[PDB]
Design an enzyme around this catalytic site. Structure first.
Site, PDB file in Angstrom:
ATOM      1  CG  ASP A  66      -2.055   1.091   1.009  1.00 49.85           C
ATOM      2  OD1 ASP A  66      -2.146   1.676  -0.091  1.00 49.85           O
ATOM      3  OD2 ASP A  66      -2.728   1.412   2.018  1.00 49.85           O
ATOM      4  CG  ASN A  91      -0.994   3.678   3.824  1.00 55.22           C
ATOM      5  OD1 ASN A  91      -1.544   4.006   4.867  1.00 55.22           O
ATOM      6  ND2 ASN A  91      -0.197   2.627   3.763  1.00 55.22           N
TER       7      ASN A  91
HETATM    8  C1  LIG Z   1      -7.532   9.015   9.470  1.00 56.88           C
HETATM    9  N1  LIG Z   1      -7.020   7.711   9.118  1.00 56.88           N
HETATM   10  C2  LIG Z   1      -5.820   7.575   8.446  1.00 56.88           C
HETATM   11  N2  LIG Z   1      -5.881   7.841   7.130  1.00 56.88           N
HETATM   12  C3  LIG Z   1      -4.788   7.691   6.384  1.00 56.88           C
HETATM   13  C4  LIG Z   1      -3.571   7.306   6.905  1.00 56.88           C
HETATM   14  C5  LIG Z   1      -3.500   7.053   8.260  1.00 56.88           C
HETATM   15  C6  LIG Z   1      -4.624   7.183   9.065  1.00 56.88           C
HETATM   16  C7  LIG Z   1      -4.534   6.875  10.536  1.00 56.88           C
HETATM   17  N3  LIG Z   1      -3.155   6.788  11.008  1.00 56.88           N
HETATM   18  C8  LIG Z   1      -2.375   7.865  11.307  1.00 56.88           C
HETATM   19  N4  LIG Z   1      -2.896   9.070  11.099  1.00 56.88           N
HETATM   20  C9  LIG Z   1      -2.151  10.138  11.417  1.00 56.88           C
HETATM   21  N5  LIG Z   1      -2.632  11.356  11.156  1.00 56.88           N
HETATM   22  C10 LIG Z   1      -3.709  11.827  10.373  1.00 56.88           C
HETATM   23  C11 LIG Z   1      -4.354  11.082   9.383  1.00 56.88           C
HETATM   24  C12 LIG Z   1      -5.401  11.629   8.650  1.00 56.88           C
HETATM   25  C13 LIG Z   1      -5.803  12.913   8.967  1.00 56.88           C
HETATM   26  C14 LIG Z   1      -5.140  13.673   9.915  1.00 56.88           C
HETATM   27  C15 LIG Z   1      -4.111  13.138  10.632  1.00 56.88           C
HETATM   28  C16 LIG Z   1      -5.777  15.024  10.006  1.00 56.88           C
HETATM   29  C17 LIG Z   1      -6.861  14.939   8.950  1.00 56.88           C
HETATM   30  O1  LIG Z   1      -7.592  15.857   8.593  1.00 56.88           O
HETATM   31  N6  LIG Z   1      -6.835  13.692   8.412  1.00 56.88           N
HETATM   32  N7  LIG Z   1      -0.937  10.106  12.004  1.00 56.88           N
HETATM   33  C18 LIG Z   1      -0.433   8.882  12.232  1.00 56.88           C
HETATM   34  C19 LIG Z   1      -1.118   7.714  11.902  1.00 56.88           C
HETATM   35  C20 LIG Z   1      -0.492   6.376  12.129  1.00 56.88           C
HETATM   36  F1  LIG Z   1      -1.178   5.592  12.912  1.00 56.88           F
HETATM   37  F2  LIG Z   1      -0.346   5.697  10.985  1.00 56.88           F
HETATM   38  F3  LIG Z   1       0.723   6.502  12.637  1.00 56.88           F
HETATM   39  S1  LIG Z   1      -7.982   6.397   9.365  1.00 56.88           S
HETATM   40  C21 LIG Z   1      -9.022   6.376   7.948  1.00 56.88           C
HETATM   41  O2  LIG Z   1      -8.794   6.646  10.502  1.00 56.88           O
HETATM   42  O3  LIG Z   1      -7.183   5.220   9.280  1.00 56.88           O
END
Ligand SMILES: CN(c1ncccc1CNc1nc(Nc2ccc3c(c2)CC(=O)N3)ncc1C(F)(F)F)S(C)(=O)=O
Length: 261
Positions: free
Chosen positions: A133, A138
């Site tokens: 991915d 991602n």
């Molecule tokens: C929101 N989601 C994600 N969408 C895409 C990639 C990653 C994630 C979730 N993971 C992470 N997400 C973030 N940050 C992040 C992300 C998406 C947004 C934001 C912050 C602000 C915003 O508007 N969208 N930082 C670290 C991680 C981690 F865990 F990988 F280390 S979901 C659909 O609930 O899975």
């Protein structure tokens, strides 16, 4: 006192829905008393045994990776409800970031992000870990200077997949190389979707003909050539990620030298 107590973690807003369950924004207080902003991954209560096993299995891999360009796992609370505490990258997805900032971004920066992701993949390639991915949706933006490869693919993203993956459900480090080049195309296109002009069924035929994504407007010719090497139909003819790190390092240097930075 090693590990993470649940009381050290306070949840706030829901960030979204992952494959296994909800992801929350929160704050973790560490052993030095520092407040760390975290993304907390959960698993649905009503999920199958095999899904729980996989949630934990993927977490233990992430816990053992410690790369500047892979999302950082801070800790795991195993007792139900099982929480995986990740570092929060508040800027979110690279595709959205690129769209938003397209008028200020320099080409040298787009090449930097490619290079950083390539470095992470070179490490995964060294342990024959197949990610599946590698795409701007991602990749997380830690800062303008730093992107991070996200979580492993649930494996349908036909428009990002090698011919052998589409034809035979075969995934190897070489199919990751194919996908990484598609990611580079996305980055140099400021987050456009690959083959947005086709439907999924049409892709393999086009690929079988030798047709490929066109050069993005701001893509240096040298970098496009490298992309087309990654899209060799034969997996064996594709560069390895260790080779691409060297090639992209050179492209990065050239773009920096042209920009006089
Ligand atoms: C929101 N989601 C994600 N969408 C895409 C990639 C990653 C994630 C979730 N993971 C992470 N997400 C973030 N940050 C992040 C992300 C998406 C947004 C934001 C912050 C602000 C915003 O508007 N969208 N930082 C670290 C991680 C981690 F865990 F990988 F280390 S979901 C659909 O609930 O899975």
């Amino acid at each position: 006192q090693y590990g993470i107590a649940r009381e050290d973690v306070v949840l706030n807003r829901i960030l979204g829905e992952g494959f296994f369950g909800e992801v929350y924004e929160g704050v973790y207080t560490n052993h030095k008393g520092e407040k760390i902003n975290v993304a907390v991954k959960t698993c649905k209560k009503d999920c199958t045994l095999d899904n729980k096993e996989k949630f934990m299995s993927e977490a233990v891999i992430m816990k053992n990776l410690d790369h500047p360009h892979i999302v950082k796992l801070i800790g795991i609370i195993e007792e139900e409800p099982t929480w995986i505490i990740m570092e929060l990258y508040p800027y979110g997805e690279l595709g959205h970031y690129l769209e938003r900032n397209k008028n200020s971004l320099k080409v040298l920066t787009l090449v930097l992000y490619s290079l950083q992701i390539c470095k992470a993949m070179a490490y995964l390639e060294s342990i024959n870990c197949v990610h599946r991915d590698i795409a701007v949706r991602n990749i997380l933006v830690a800062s303008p200077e730093c992107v991070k490869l996200g979580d492993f693919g649930l494996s349908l993203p036909i428009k990002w997949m090698s011919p052998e993956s589409i034809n035979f459900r075969r995934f190897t480090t070489a199919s990751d190389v194919w996908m990484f080049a598609v990611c580079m195309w996305e980055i140099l296109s400021f987050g456009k979707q690959p083959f947005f002009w086709l439907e999924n069924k049409d892709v393999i035929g086009v690929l079988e003909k030798g047709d490929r994504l066109p050069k993005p407007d701001l893509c240096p010719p040298v970098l496009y050539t490298l992309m087309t090497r990654c899209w060799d139909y034969d997996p064996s003819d594709r560069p390895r990620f260790t080779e691409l790190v060297c090639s992209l390092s050179d492209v990065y240097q050239m773009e920096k030298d042209i920009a006089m930075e």
